[PDB]
Design a protein around this ligand. Sequence first.
Ligand SMILES: [Zn+2]
Length: 258
Amino acid sequence: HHWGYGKHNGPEHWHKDFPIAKGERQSPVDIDTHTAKYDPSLKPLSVSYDQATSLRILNNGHAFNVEFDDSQDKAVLKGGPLDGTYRLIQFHFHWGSLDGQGSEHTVDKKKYAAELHLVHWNTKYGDFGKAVQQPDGMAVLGIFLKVGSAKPGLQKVVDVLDSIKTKGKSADFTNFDPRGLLPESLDYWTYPGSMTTPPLLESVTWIVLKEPISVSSEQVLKFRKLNFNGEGEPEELMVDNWRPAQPLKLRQIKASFK
Ligand SMILES: [Zn+2]
C-alpha cells in the first residue's frame, strides 16, 4: 500500500518515497541537555486555548488525531521562538509497546513511554495545506508522557478509543479542553525541524516541553489496544508508532530556561 511503522514499510524505508527523509532538518532529535544553550531573548510561550473547539477523533491508521476547528483564531500558540500566530488544528500521540519506548524526541537518549504533539499552522499562509510548504509554516508543541498517576484531562480521550478501534473510524469529540493535557511548567527546548511522518516536510518549529506529564499504566494500555488495520482485516495492534531520533546536523537546540 504505502508507509507505516513495520519492518517492511517503516522509518528505514521512508526515504525511497520521501527523499527529504535524509535532509538537513529532520525530526525528531535527541535533545542533549548539556549542549542546549539558554537563550535569554526567548519569550515565554503563549498558549491560548480558552476558545478551543474540538470536533472529531479519527483513527488514521498511524495514530489517532483529535481535530479542531481552525477556521478562525480560537486556539492559538504565540510567543516563544515564534513570530505571529499559529492555529491549533489537531493533536495526536506516538507511543510504544513497552513503557521504556514510544517518544520520538529523547532527552540525553532517554525515551519516554509516549509523546503528545499539538500541531499548529501559521495563519499568515491562510490554510494548513499552504502552511506545510513553508519553512515557518508549522509549530508543534511536544510533551512527553511518563507512566505514573493518571492524567485526568486525558481520560475522555481514553474513554472514546473503543469506538475508533480501526483505521478510518471516527467519532464526534466536541467540547474537549486541550488545556488539561499540559504540565505545570511551560519551560521548553526549541529547534527547527520537520514532520516526523511522511511527507517529512521541513516546515516545523519544534517546541518541546521540559516537564513530562504523568499518565497511568491503564491509560497507555488502552492506546495499545488500538489497531493499525481496517475493520474486517487481520488485527495489528497500534504500538511503536514513533520515528527514531535523526541527525542534528549542526542545528542548535535552544532552551527557554537556565
Ligand atoms: Zn507527531
